[PDB]
Design a protein around this ligand. Structure first.
Ligand SMILES: *[C@@H]1O[C@H](CO)[C@@H](O[C@@H]2O[C@H](CO)[C@@H](O[C@@H]3O[C@H](CO)[C@@H](O)[C@H](O[C@H]4O[C@H](CO)[C@@H](O)[C@H](O)[C@@H]4O)[C@@H]3O)[C@H](O)[C@H]2NC(C)=O)[C@H](O)[C@H]1NC(C)=O
Lengths: 140, 301
């Protein structure tokens, strides 16, 4: 019921866009697909809903984060920034799963954006393994 | 002053001429009270008397093994090491700077998979009186266990009189979770003592950033009569399993003495093979950009 191959493509599109970012001319605050989240291969076989609920939660968090003062405030993002597209693809992937901070200095905001985008590469790397594995082993 | 190891103490010194140094108090671990004298290394010169000895530690002449005596009776020893801070920066004399990926890279670590096992390397020109101690953990606030072996000589290059040495150590995370997204990095800590000088080093990383897969295994060619070839390989034995989850992506290259490259997620590919060429394949994690593996080649024809 999950629609694995669409998720597989959207998470692939996120891996590609996230690695094309470079705003700089550890990440304490975000979410992570942890060991207890059950997104390892065996955990997917046994309880795929539990894992995908925690991926959805993190995707929503990253959407909201990319669509906030950290990224929409000054210094303005450059027209060649991938943030806008990532926002759209994060939103698209979280809909497939279910239809229904803020420093002062601008140099500190650039650094913060970089840590968030670097964190997202790790997050979507795991999600892509989840959707690739489920497409291979959990699809009828 | 702080204790490195029983009866071994480290003294931190701002290293510059006409520097005041540190006033250090040594204490003789003995139940005797009277008749106590102090000496340093192999000098008979009595430097003080009583259960304690106060010294102004300014140079390596003030460092060494202090011994307290009760006449001919040796009592206890205190070894002082110096950690010199030069120009406001802790010395890095003992290890050679590898300058890769960036400057002041003294330890380099690698993993072949997501198992929690990894290896770290470093270089030195020193051949004698050299001791290394390795410790590791994931996180700082509440460290999680990582078990490390002993550093050992892995390689040596000698050109005439200039000798260069490579050391390595294998470590492993106690409770590894290969699929998890790491939030806290691994910390690798190396103490280096040479004669009386103490230096230490650290490397902070995530396993996913030090991944370098082994080369693809069992690379083979099947010809087809416009001289095309069916290239096929298998994942390396050491890569994480299942491959449906820990996927690799591949680059297949045709090169002779002009190049043809194809990039595929499959473990097979069709290329046009010419005389005296070579089919090479290398591998990378499919979803996270880390190091490419070494090429694996098979001659063309
Ligand atoms: C790499 O080198 C650095 C620089 O030398 C080193 O940092 C030092 O670590 C030691 C050990 O933790 C610190 O010593 C402590 O200092 C505080 C005061 O600043 C003291 O309160 C501590 O006292 C406790 O420990 C003593 C024995 O060590 C006891 O005598 C005492 O009763 C207490 O139990 C302790 O002395 C030192 O301050 C730092 N120095 C700096 C500049 O940070 C670092 O630890 C080294 N890395 C490794 C892995 O060893």
């Amino acid at each position: 019921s999950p629609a694995w191959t669409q998720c597989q493509q959207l998470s692939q599109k996120l891996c590609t866009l996230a690695w094309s970012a470079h705003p700089l001319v550890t990440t304490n605050d975000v979410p992570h697909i942890q060991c207890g989240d059950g997104c390892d291969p065996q955990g997917l076989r046994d309880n795929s809903q539990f894992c995908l609920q925690r991926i959805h939660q993190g995707l929503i968090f990253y959407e909201k984060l990319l669509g906030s003062d950290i990224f929409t405030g000054e210094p303005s993002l450059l027209p060649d920034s991938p943030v806008g597209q990532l926002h759209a693809s994060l939103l698209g992937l979280s809909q497939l799963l279910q239809p229904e901070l803020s420093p002062s200095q601008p140099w500190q905001r650039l650094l913060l954006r970089f840590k968030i985008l670097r964190s997202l590469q790790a997050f979507v790397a795991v999600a892509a393994r989840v959707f690739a594995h489920g497409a291979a082993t959990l699809s009828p | 002053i702080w204790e490195l190891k029983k009866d071994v103490y480290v003294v931190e010194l701002d290293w510059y001429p006409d520097a005041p140094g540190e006033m250090v108090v040594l204490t003789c671990d003995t139940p005797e009270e009277d008749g106590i004298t102090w000496t340093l290394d192999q000098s008979s010169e009595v430097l003080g008397s009583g259960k304690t000895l106060t010294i102004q530690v300014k140079e390596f002449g003030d460092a060494g093994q202090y011994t307290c005596h009760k006449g001919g009776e040796v009592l206890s020893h205190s070894l002082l090491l110096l950690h010199k801070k030069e120009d406001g920066i802790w010395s890095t004399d003992i290890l050679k700077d590898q300058k890769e990926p960036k400057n002041k890279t003294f330890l380099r670590c690698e993993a072949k998979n997501y198992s929690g096992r990894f290896t770290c390397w470093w270089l030195t020109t020193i051949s004698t009186d050299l001791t290394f101690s390795v410790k590791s953990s994931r996180g700082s606030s509440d460290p999680q266990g990582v078990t490390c072996g002993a550093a050992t000589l892995s390689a040596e290059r000698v050109r005439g009189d200039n000798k260069e040495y490579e050391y390595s150590v294998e470590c492993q995370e106690d409770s590894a979770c290969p699929a998890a997204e790491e939030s806290l990095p691994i910390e690798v800590m190396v103490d280096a003592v040479h004669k009386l000088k103490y230096e230490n080093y650290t490397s902070s990383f995530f396993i996913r950033d030090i991944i370098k897969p082994d080369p693809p295994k069992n690379l083979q060619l099947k010809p087809l009569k416009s001289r095309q070839v069916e290239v096929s390989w298998e994942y390396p034995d050491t890569w994480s399993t299942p491959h449906s989850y820990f996927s690799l992506t591949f680059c297949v290259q045709v090169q002779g003495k002009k190049k043809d490259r194809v990039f595929t997620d499959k473990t097979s590919a069709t290329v046009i093979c010419r005389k005296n060429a070579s089919i090479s394949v290398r591998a990378q994690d499919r979803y996270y950009s880390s190091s490419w593996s070494e090429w694996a080649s098979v001659p063309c024809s």
